[PDB]
Design a binder for this molecule. Sequence first.
Ligand SMILES: NC(=O)c1coc(CN(Cc2ccc3c(c2)OCO3)C(=O)c2coc(CN(Cc3ccc4c(c3)OCO4)C(=O)c3coc(CCl)n3)n2)n1
Ligand SMILES: NC(=O)c1coc(CN(Cc2ccc3c(c2)OCO3)C(=O)c2coc(CN(Cc3ccc4c(c3)OCO4)C(=O)c3coc(CCl)n3)n2)n1
Ligand SMILES: CCCCCCCCC(=O)CCCO
Ligand SMILES: CCCCCCCCC(=O)CCCO
Lengths: 121, 121, 121, 121
Amino acid sequence: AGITGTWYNQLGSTFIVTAGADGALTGTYESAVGNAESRYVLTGRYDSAPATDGSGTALGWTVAWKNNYRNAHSATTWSGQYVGGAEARINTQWLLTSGTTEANAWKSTLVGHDTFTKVKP
Amino acid sequence: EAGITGTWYNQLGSTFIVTAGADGALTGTYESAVGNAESRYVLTGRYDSAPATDGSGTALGWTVAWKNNYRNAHSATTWSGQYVGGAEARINTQWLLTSGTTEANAWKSTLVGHDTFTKVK
Amino acid sequence: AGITGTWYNQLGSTFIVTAGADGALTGTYESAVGNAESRYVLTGRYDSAPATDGSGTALGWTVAWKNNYRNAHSATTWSGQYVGGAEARINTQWLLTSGTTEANAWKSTLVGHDTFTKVKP
Amino acid sequence: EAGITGTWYNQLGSTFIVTAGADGALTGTYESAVGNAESRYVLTGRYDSAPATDGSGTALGWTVAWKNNYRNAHSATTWSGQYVGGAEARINTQWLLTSGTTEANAWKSTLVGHDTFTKVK
Ligand SMILES: NC(=O)c1coc(CN(Cc2ccc3c(c2)OCO3)C(=O)c2coc(CN(Cc3ccc4c(c3)OCO4)C(=O)c3coc(CCl)n3)n2)n1
Ligand SMILES: NC(=O)c1coc(CN(Cc2ccc3c(c2)OCO3)C(=O)c2coc(CN(Cc3ccc4c(c3)OCO4)C(=O)c3coc(CCl)n3)n2)n1
Ligand SMILES: CCCCCCCCC(=O)CCCO
Ligand SMILES: CCCCCCCCC(=O)CCCO
């Protein structure tokens, strides 16, 4: 199959992505219900010629949490790897930075991890 | 927009050339002074195109997959941070560098760090 | 039950910890086989009076990877929360810093996540 | 040993008083200039007691659970980093601040950042 497709986490997120031949990732990141107000633009990059030794495919993407409905003044980046096969998976670590004053900059960034599969919950 | 658009350097001597689009897109090229990297790489990301007008920074993020026509490190870095405008413009970030690995080495796939970018002119 | 006990991850780690009444965490971190050469001292802290609203118990600990047999010139810290109940769990994020030269300091720190339970694999 | 032992301050004005034991223990107190914190808190950690003698830093880590006799923030911070000796002694760290949360808010339990500690005298 491949990176292109509809992916889901176990917490209520869905993202739809196209992986371009030369490394582009473009798509939408949304809630499980998928209403317009919860949909945000996603853009990133992936290694379009991964190693031929069984290693995963490195990738990353960003979502700024602003759309035509809402603005959280924040952005998340996910850095991870795609692993193909019967149950394709994208394993990531992420950073969510909020726009803050200088006084609050020390606590501007959340960190976490998330795994996505193409299985709809 | 104009605030983010331009040439930036980090504390290691890396170069980031970016254009901030009216729709929240970040596009440009990145040249790393460190790691398994040579020449320029494509970058893509997102920023908050309508930040708060309260002295808060502008949230943003971008990705570089470390493949270009000259080298392939089978890895990708995401930078998550905020742009702080004014006379002394800076982009303060935290980053995640993920390498494609086998499943047994996935626990040690990701490096974390922090870069401060200073705007040229 | 509680934090005190023998915990395991899904990758071949085991740790034995005592949680003191006033917040101390003290124990041993080792491989699944548990031979002397893979055993390292663990020390940390936990919140000894967690919130009474269903929230997890915050904690953290460190292992420096030096014992009487080996020295990797590195140290890992785990930051997370303990969640009690029938299948007690400790959910963590971790940072593994290696001692490096100044030239390699940018790539000194790995990041990851791990979950532990009291179930022996 | 003597290199690490002493009083340190970070870029935010926080105070770290530590004793490095011959067995690799770090013990002391921490006073934070930021966050839900007041007065001194116990800290415990570990360091590499036999670092490489090649100009590399000394790996270390420590934890503070944000409970003392005056306040309880139901959170814990771990710092992972390296001590760089000489006339200009520094401890360069990355940290993870985890708060106890309900399961629904666990995704946003952990903040990440970086602190530089400078040794007094
Ligand atoms: N609803 C908006 O309009 C909007 C505007 O801004 C944001 C930012 N967010 C989404 C978000 C997803 C993923 C991330 C992130 C942030 O940062 C880190 O990764 C949240 O405030 C949020 C609140 O509750 C959760 C939890 N959840 C379910 C969910 C609810 C609403 C969503 C949504 C997902 O997608 C858009 O809408 C996750 O799936 C979850 C959170 O984090 C992880 C990985 Cl561990 N999974 N998220 N939402
Ligand atoms: N063997 C030593 O004598 C010695 C000296 O120094 C170290 C450092 N290590 C252990 C380690 C555990 C846990 C961590 C860590 C590092 O940093 C982050 O968390 C590794 O080099 C390592 C190599 O392979 C793995 C994977 N694995 C199995 C394992 C093998 C040997 C062990 C061991 C565990 O325990 C001691 O011995 C994990 O369980 C694993 C790694 O990471 C995660 C969380 Cl995702 N799980 N680890 N080993
Ligand atoms: C170990 C070699 C792989 C690295 C390829 C280039 C990555 C550069 C990077 O992420 C820099 C982060 C600090 O600015
Ligand atoms: C939001 C309030 C909770 C914080 C309690 C104190 C934490 C201090 C901390 O980790 C500082 C990290 C930067 O030096």
